């Protein structure tokens, strides 16, 4: 195990005046080496996604992006007020391949069903990572990587209810958020497909907790970026209520909603809470033009309640998130420098 400053790789377009392409062109390289990954037969290697120094470096890179990219109108940080120009700019995350310099190497776990922590009896040697988009969101991981086999749930400690459960889906669920043109938005999720998706998540949770009843609930409360599904779509911050998504009971039925497809009440806020460090930030009014963005729910961030005393009758899970590091561990769990 070692730690060195890694570089990155992207198909960034210099001619594109969008923040991700501009930054990547100025701080990355098209690459790549060919053709495959050097497989290591009969070699076991231990991994630890919940302590990978790769995520920390990436986290600082994602932050450094927003700093020179989205310029807020007002910035409140530790009793400090900062006002500045806030021009609107195209904002679309671009896949980034973090590569290792000369001298070191990157071990990749080929095991399709890998929890992220433990022995891996099928590793390899890669020069750089795969396509990883800087998706900043909460509750629902967007535009990530699907599982090659079954859905996989991960947690630094399933026992500790204060920990996050990084869920990976094997089948992507499409979500359509559009602002018609008032300044209000709404999202669309196939009720049929999303159902079975919850089913799959349930049988996995029920499996990890020997024998209990799985029941989803809305957010227990907190900040608007935690209570609702917060995400960036076209340089705008959306806050969509997902009380309809996480409201089902598993253990023989309970509550089924219909109406063909699910529609979530959403809205755009100018005053948001910074995800980088502690503080707030106000931005410019919504764009007069229309905003269409269709994303892909390939992952979920859930938090378990449970615990207390006197046996168990049922478990409860809620849409979690917040720490964007969890969003990177869903893509960098099978890598090791």
């Amino acid at each position, epitope marked *: 195990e070692a730690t060195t400053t890694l570089f990155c790789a992207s198909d960034a377009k*210099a*001619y594109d005046t969008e923040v991700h392409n501009v930054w990547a062109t*100025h701080a*990355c390289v098209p690459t790549d080496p060919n053709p495959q990954e050097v497989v290591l037969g009969n070699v076991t290697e231990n991994f630890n996604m919940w302590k990978n120094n790769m995520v920390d470096q990436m986290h600082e890179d994602i932050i450094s992006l927003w700093d020179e990219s989205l310029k807020p109108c007002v910035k409140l940080t530790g009793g400090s007020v900062i006002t500045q120009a806030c021009p609107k700019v195209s904002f679309q995350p671009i896949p980034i391949h973090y590569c290792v310099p000369a001298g070191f190497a990157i071990l990749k776990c080929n095991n399709k069903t890998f929890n992220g922590s433990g022995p891996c009896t099928n590793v390899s040697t890669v020069q750089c990572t795969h396509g990883i988009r800087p998706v900043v969101s909460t509750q629902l991981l967007l535009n990530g990587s699907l599982a090659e086999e079954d859905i996989v749930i991960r947690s630094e400690d399933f026992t500790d209810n204060v920990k996050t459960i990084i869920v990976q889906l094997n089948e992507s669920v499409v979500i359509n958020c559009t602002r018609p043109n008032i300044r209000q938005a709404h999202c669309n999720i196939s009720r049929a497909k999303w159902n079975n998706t919850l089913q799959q998540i349930v049988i996995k949770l029920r499996e990890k907790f020997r024998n209990k009843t799985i029941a989803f609930n809305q957010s227990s409360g907190g900040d608007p970026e935690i209570v609702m599904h917060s995400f960036n779509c076209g340089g705008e911050f959306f806050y969509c209520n997902t009380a309809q998504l996480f409201n089902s009971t598993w253990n023989v039925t309970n509550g089924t909603e219909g109406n063909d497809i699910i529609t979530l009440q959403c809205r755009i806020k100018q005053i948001i809470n910074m995800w980088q460090k502690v503080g707030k930030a106000m931005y410019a009014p919504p764009i007069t033009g229309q905003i269409r963005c269709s994303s892909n729910i390939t992952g979920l961030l859930l938090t378990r309640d449970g615990g207390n005393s006197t046996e168990t009758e049922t478990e409860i899970f809620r849409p979690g998130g917040g720490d964007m590091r969890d969003n990177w561990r869903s893509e960098l769990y099978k890598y090791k420098v």
Partner: antibody
Amino acid sequence: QVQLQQWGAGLLKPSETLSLTCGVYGESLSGHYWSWVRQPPGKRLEWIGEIKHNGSPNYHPSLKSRVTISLDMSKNQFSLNLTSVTAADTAVYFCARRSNWPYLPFDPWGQGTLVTVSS
Amino acid sequence: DIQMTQSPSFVSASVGDRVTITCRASQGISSYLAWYQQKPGKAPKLVIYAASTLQSGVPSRFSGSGSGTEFTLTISSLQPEDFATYYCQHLIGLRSFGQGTKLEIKR
């Protein structure tokens, strides 16, 4: 060893099109990029763009709407388009190979082709 | 956009003398720089890349250093063939070069 040769019309007129071709001898186009770099008379060099064997080009911001780089994988050669040329396009265009990270420097280079646009 | 300015633009040094040309950047670029040697009616020749990494074949008298904004290309002992025009390049971003430094003989 590898040598990059360049051929094409040097003397051009306004509104016309620049079409230069750089041939590769001693190496295949595979596993390597191929970029064009011009240099105005008595000025710094300027990276125009580079194309990959996959077909995805990477042009310069102010030259995207005119520059078009392709690949002739059958003859191991690549070309450089430039629609609607003007007097400001008068320069010596070069062609160089760009390897993969960490190796990025342009190498080898071509002998260059002097281009002049006049009416 | 990052600007690359070299200094001086015109160096006068006799053969065998020690010469040192600099290249300042408007913004931080770490170690994404290269140097090239170009003679009249000829194409540039890669001298030193990665700011301080010498190209295969390049004489030992050629050396480079610096990181961030300030950079340096030093030649221990000059030779009749060393006299030419040197350019500095931002290996990434817009791949912009410098106005170049023309090294000539002194009399």
